[PDB]
Design a protein around this ligand. Structure first.
Ligand SMILES: CCCCCCCCCCCCO[C@@H]1O[C@H](CO)[C@@H](O[C@H]2O[C@H](CO)[C@@H](O)[C@H](O)[C@H]2O)[C@H](O)[C@H]1O
Ligand SMILES: CCCCCCCCCCCCO[C@@H]1O[C@H](CO)[C@@H](O[C@H]2O[C@H](CO)[C@@H](O)[C@H](O)[C@H]2O)[C@H](O)[C@H]1O
Lengths: 1034, 155, 48, 48
């Protein structure tokens, strides 16, 4: 094939142009996002029961839905939690590769059929089924600076005006309102209701009658009386539209004739659907929009379009309303793409310098300049064809490929330049021979590199999805580089290069290049003399190899492991947990101090603080809240002192002084979608209907035993909340029936007043919105207020709630968890310093076996993924290692010689581990992919030395040592040229302190350090390996 | 106080070793959460016999009442902690203690049908004819629950 | 094109004063002029 | 595909005759099938 295109250079250009256009086309159509779909498909069923406790929600909603979640395909596990805010969330996680649309519709369909089994109040509110596994592109914040609008006023505006317009914007895949639109709030007064002998029952009944859409009919409707001329629709009673109309709602007409209206016995205003969450942005009232990227959409185009639409809305905003961007993931994607182009531009510039330093002719420096961009564009075409996207993982995959793409370009051109310099052939005849020496080897190298990376893509779950991004990108880039090396560069070499006279090594020149050529020719004789001496005493160098292999194993075990590196994302969170029974006001005072600290002591770092009172990830309530800290640009925060980790430590220590509150800061995970992914996720299951109280005692027992092993297990705590004091009220059935008071009127008056009641809908400025009746704050606070509420008996006498009720204090769960239908309690923890997560799980299983009868367990989330991933690893390494051997065995036509190549693997790994251990990094994905690439090129260097050495013995009949010494001499220059260019190419990635540095550091460190050793050791050890192996076997 | 909140948690959780250390450092035994529950209230509720004795040795109020008038004996009797009920009564617990509803330890004991505790309360002089806010006695509860064994004891 | 509509307002205060429930008014008006689907029946062995 | 050399037959009420008339029509077919042992074997209803 190389011969075919040496004689047909225009054909070679056509294929190169076809590849370029395919790549250029692919670049335009290719999706662009920060990360691809890593987490397995998850469908979350969300329901709401206003004024309901955790147990009411669980026993009427959660359990009923869970029992009906059958006939659904490819379900791994089901998890749910029911809390005292009246909320339930059932997450169904599916097998990796499951269609998320088919998964959601199957879950949705089973819910629909289970809807008639749920309470009427839950059916009114409805039950949402959403794909929860998806993550946010950005969070658009909406604030009011002149204090003319509340969070309810802002929320309604965003919903009524902005939401649909942003939802319609090009590339937008989902928009969640951080708040609710207005609701008609009736704030009932018990003193006024009792005065007119009325109850919440009467208020609800009246609203349902006087705020309703009534069907009438038509004038002259069919079948008509013939002769009828006009046909008109009859409009009867329609929904109310204003607070005024609701105010005029008639409740009672007295004897004297005076009228009792709704405004007489209640305050009527537009407000929120709930008041559980209080959102503040730098202390000012705030709402916002959580925007998700659509499937196949371009993140940079989508965000630009979102800002463009908000810019057109700017002239129609009320005075004080402002747009802010506390969270935006596009700066990463833009930098990830920019630094990829920058790297590969600098890479081509670096090759040019090194190519001219050694070859000293511009005609030779242009062959890699053409070949490299062609292969890169080719990769984008294969990337698109396999349905992959331009993301952080695929982008750093191409940065790790350049070392292997550059090598192919140099090796081909350098070998032609050498053959001409030594034999004195014309470029055309020289290339034919030069390619003849390497064409069989490059095909062999291609098959080996495939066997290294391809099996890595066949990992299952989350880790397999991450590896697949690097695997396909490197294997594609590698594959195309070989085709371009067997088609284009041979044709280029034969036509573009200039003839070199036999024995012209550039020692006849003057100046710098004349001096350099003499130096290098002297250094080559020095090197070949060193190998000659090394091969006289192979025995001691085999000992020196085992020290490297033992030293490698030692470092590999002691190097701390972690999936992905912690990144400065310009955003982190501050959790605020107050004691059991703590109120909204108390939690706000703590959030105000957190906000005050960050805008005072971190004025030069923090841009804004988004204070969310009422919401937590570990559970909701008035006694929880999170502050989302938004930092300034990385260029306006120099040094490690002004980084997330530094600020995180300062904040944690600063808020340690605060009393009656657990306050601490922490950085976000590298991938928000996936989650923590550091430690284990344990589920403690009630397998024999033991109950909540007994499952708590078994949990406390497991935690107590975990605390007795600090050497193995660390920070082993429950994820859920603890039991809290709750006001138990017992309605006397006998006393109720005796006074002639119905239980419905009692349970309605209580539930409506204290809990709230969603009555029906009304239309506010052509927008259908909810009508809620509830007690005015001051009449539903303390147990003394219970007695102020009256219910009318059959005889018309008003009876106080105290007359037919008795109350006491008991403890109950404000958040009840369930795993796979059964009652559960989620326990988090991690392995102690030096210990692996796998070992920590072994003990947790052992401790769990000694728990009371009927108490089971299971592994969920990252733990479920790790175990099924750990089972695959051994089989994949084995497959990978067997095929590498089989390929090299076919290449060299020997079962023995392949070992000489495979013995170089530890030479690159030692340097990577030395670099990582020294710099204080972890055994992460970027590092692990960095090792596989380092092993790739180190093997590639050795493969050519062994092939050349073997061919000299087979063809020209040279001796073992003669051929080996001749091989290393010919191989020295192209090895040094490749290594020099690639080490300088990954220099910016190592020293990078700014944005996405955690990725670049993990990439650069392992590669650079590995390349240094893989270069310096291999040139002395490869000749030893080949000689020692050849001597042993025949 | 600081130790007062730690003792409340310790007494509830049932960490005897932590309670011991807190009694030495001088943690407030009359400490109360928002609902008015002392460590003794909690210890009695969650059935921690050893801590009830330790708290009472360190001058804990045996007849402490919450914001609804319920005492540790009310809780111990209701949730069937026979050992704790005896300890409380030995240390001078008001056997006829009425909450805001007029409910007694005997009423609560009879309601869940704790036959042993009912006989212990009557031994220490429980008013068998004591009426709650609805005029219901422990006997009126027994016949309504359909507890023939409990019915015989209250005659 | 825009059609003329016959808007009819039920004075619920007058209805109450005369002792007439609004449900019976809405049903009478609704059923008469518009029609009302009550329940099903079997016509030659078919639900209609 | 069920049994080797057997058939699954369905007698339909097209005119809305009724269950009683269809049972009679079925009996007439079952009785006429009993007159042909040489061709038809074990011809019976799957219903009650
Ligand atoms: C370029 C040429 C290279 C082509 C590479 C082809 C990739 C290999 C395809 C298979 C990928 C999946 O790999 C497959 O994983 C499962 C586990 O889930 C293994 O199954 C495993 O089961 C249990 C798990 O505890 C092990 O004890 C057992 O040793 C092993 O068989 C299969 O043995 C393996 O084949
Ligand atoms: C661990 C730090 C990193 C170093 C990695 C190890 C490889 C690089 C080290 C330098 C290699 C050159 O060092 C080489 O050593 C051998 C030792 O047998 C010397 O060889 C020596 O012994 C042989 C006989 O055994 C004599 O014929 C020779 O005259 C004598 O010098 C070579 O003359 C020297 O050039």
């Amino acid at each position: 094939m190389p011969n075919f295109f040496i004689d047909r250079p225009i054909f070679a250009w056509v294929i190169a142009i076809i590849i370029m256009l395919a790549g250029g086309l692919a670049i335009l159509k290719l999706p662009v996002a920060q990360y691809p779909t890593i987490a397995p498909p998850a469908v979350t069923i969300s329901a709401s029961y206003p004024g309901a406790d955790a147990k009411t929600v669980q026993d009427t909603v959660t359990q009923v839905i869970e029992q009906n979640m059958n006939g659904i395909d490819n379900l791994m596990y089901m998890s749910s939690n029911s809390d005292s805010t009246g909320t339930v969330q059932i997450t169904l996680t599916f097998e990796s590769g499951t269609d998320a649309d088919i998964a959601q519709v199957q879950v949705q369909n089973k819910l629909q059929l289970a809807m008639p089994l749920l309470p009427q109040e839950v059916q009114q509110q409805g039950v949402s089924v959403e794909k929860s596994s998806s993550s946010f592109l950005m969070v658009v914040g909406v604030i009011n600076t002149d204090g003319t609008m509340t969070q309810e006023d802002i929320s309604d505006y965003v919903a009524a005006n902005m939401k649909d317009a942003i939802s319609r914007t090009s590339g937008v895949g989902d928009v969640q309102l951080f708040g609710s639109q207005y609701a008609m709030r009736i704030w009932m007064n018990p003193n006024e209701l009792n005065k007119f002998q009325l109850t919440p029952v009467d208020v609800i009944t009246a609203i349902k009658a006087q705020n309703a859409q009534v069907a009438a009919g038509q004038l002259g409707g069919t079948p008509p009386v013939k002769g009828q001329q006009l046909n008109a629709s009859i409009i009867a009673q329609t929904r109310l539209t204003s607070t005024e109309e609701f105010g005029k709602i008639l409740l009672k007409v007295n004897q004297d004739g005076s009228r009792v209206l709704l405004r007489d016995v209640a305050k009527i205003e537009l407000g929120g659907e709930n008041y559980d969450i209080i959102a503040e942005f730098n202390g000012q009232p705030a709402s916002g929009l959580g925007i998700k990227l659509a499937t196949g959409a371009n993140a940079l185009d989508t965000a630009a379009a979102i800002r463009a639409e908000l810019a057109k809305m700017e002239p129609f905003f009320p005075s004080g309303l402002k747009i802010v961007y506390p969270y935006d993931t596009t700066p990463f994607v833009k930098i990830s793409i920019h630094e990829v182009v920058k790297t590969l531009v600098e890479a081509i510039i670096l090759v040019f310098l090194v190519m001219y330093l050694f070859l000293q002719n511009f005609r030779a420096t242009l062959i890699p300049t053409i070949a490299v961009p062609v292969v890169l564009l080719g990769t984008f075409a294969v990337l698109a064809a396999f349905g992959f996207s331009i993301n952080t993982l695929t982008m750093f995959g191409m940065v790790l490929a350049i070392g292997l793409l550059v090598d192919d370009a140099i090796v081909v051109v350098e070998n032609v330049e050498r053959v001409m310099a030594e034999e004195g052939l014309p470029p055309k005849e020289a290339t034919r021979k030069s390619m003849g020496q390497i064409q069989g080897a490059l095909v062999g190298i291609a098959m080996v590199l495939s066997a290294v990376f391809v099996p890595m893509a066949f990992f299952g779950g989350s880790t397999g999805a991450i590896y697949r991004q690097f695997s396909i990108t490197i294997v594609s880039a590698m594959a195309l580089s070989v085709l371009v090396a067997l088609i284009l560069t041979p044709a280029l070499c034969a036509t573009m290069l200039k003839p070199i006279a036999k024995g012209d090594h550039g020692e006849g020149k003057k100046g710098f290049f004349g001096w350099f050529n003499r130096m290098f020719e002297k250094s080559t004789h020095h090197y070949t003399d060193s190998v000659g001496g090394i091969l006289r005493s192979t025995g001691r160098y085999l000992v020196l190899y085992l020290i490297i292999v033992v030293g490698m194993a030692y470092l590999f075990v002691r190097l701390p492991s972690s999936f992905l590196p912690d990144e400065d994302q310009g955003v982190f969170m501050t959790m605020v947990q107050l004691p059991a029974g703590a109120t909204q006001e108390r939690t706000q005072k703590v959030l105000n101090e957190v906000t005050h600290y960050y805008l005072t002591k971190e004025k030069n770092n923090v841009e804004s603080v988004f204070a969310v009172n009422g919401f937590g990830f570990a559970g909701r309530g008035q006694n929880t809240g999170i502050a989302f800290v938004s930092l300034k640009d990385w260029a306006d925060r120099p040094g490690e002192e002004n980084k997330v980790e530094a600020i995180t430590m300062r904040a944690t220590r600063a808020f340690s002084q605060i009393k009656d509150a657990m306050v601490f800061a922490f950085n976000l995970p590298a991938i928000v979608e996936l989650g923590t992914a550091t430690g284990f996720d344990f589920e403690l299951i009630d397998q024999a209907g033991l109950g909540h109280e007994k499952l708590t005692q078994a949990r406390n027992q497991l935690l107590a035993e975990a605390a007795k092993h600090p050497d193995m297990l660390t920070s082993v705590r429950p994820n859920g909340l603890e039991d809290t004091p709750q006001f138990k009220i017992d309605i006397d059935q006998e006393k109720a029936q005796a006074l002639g008071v119905s239980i419905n009127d009692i349970n309605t008056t209580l539930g409506a007043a204290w809990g709230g009641s969603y009555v029906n809908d009304f239309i506010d400025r052509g927008r259908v919105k909810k009508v809620y009746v509830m007690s005015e704050a001051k009449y539903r606070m303390l147990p003394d207020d219970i007695g102020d509420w009256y219910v009318r008996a059959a005889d018309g006498q008003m009876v106080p709630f105290s007359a037919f009720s008795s109350s006491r204090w008991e403890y109950g769960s404000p958040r009840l968890e369930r795993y796979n239908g059964l009652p559960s309690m989620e326990i988090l923890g991690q392995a102690a310093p030096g210990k692996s997560t796998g070992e920590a799980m072994e003990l947790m299983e052992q401790l769990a076996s000694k728990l009371p009868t009927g108490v089971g367990y299971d592994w969920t989330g990252m733990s479920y993924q790790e175990r099924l991933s750990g089972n695959q690893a051994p089989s994949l390494y084995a497959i990978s290692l067997i095929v590498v051997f089989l390929c090299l065995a076919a290449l060299y036509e020997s079962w023995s010689i392949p070992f000489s190549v495979m013995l170089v693997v530890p030479l690159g790994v030692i340097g990577a581990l030395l670099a990582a251990t020294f710099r204080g990094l972890t055994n992460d994905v970027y590092f692990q992919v960095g090792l596989l690439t380092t092993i790739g090129l180190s093997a590639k260097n050795a493969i050519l030395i062994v092939e050349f050495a073997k061919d000299l013995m087979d063809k020209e009949g040279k001796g073992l040592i003669e051929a080996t010494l001749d091989a290393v001499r010919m191989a020295l220059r192209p090895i040094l040229m490749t290594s020099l260019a690639f080490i300088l190419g990954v220099m910016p990635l190592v020293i990078s302190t700014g944005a996405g540095s955690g990725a670049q550091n993990a990439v650069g460190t392992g590669v650079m350090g590995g390349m240094v050793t893989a270069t310096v050791l291999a040139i002395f050890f490869v000749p030893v390996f080949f000689v020692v192996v050849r001597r042993r076997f025949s | 106080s600081d130790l007062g909140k730690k003792l409340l948690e310790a007494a509830r959780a049932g960490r005897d070793d932590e309670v011991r250390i807190l009694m030495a450092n001088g943690a407030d035994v009359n400490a109360a959460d928002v609902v008015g529950w002392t460590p003794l209230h909690l210890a009695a509720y969650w059935g921690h016999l050893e801590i009830v004795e330790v708290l009472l040795k360190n001058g804990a109020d045996v007849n402490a009442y919450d914001t609804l008038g319920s005492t540790p004996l009310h809780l111990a009797a209701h949730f069937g902690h026979l050992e704790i009920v005896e300890v409380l009564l030995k240390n001078g617990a008001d056997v006829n203690a009425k909450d805001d509803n007029g409910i007694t330890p005997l009423h609560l004991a009879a309601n869940r049908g704790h036959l042993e505790i009912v006989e212990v309360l009557l031994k220490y002089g429980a008013d068998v004819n004591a009426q709650d806010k609805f005029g219901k006695t422990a006997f009126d509860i027994s016949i309504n629950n359909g507890n023939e064994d409990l019915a015989e004891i209250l005659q």
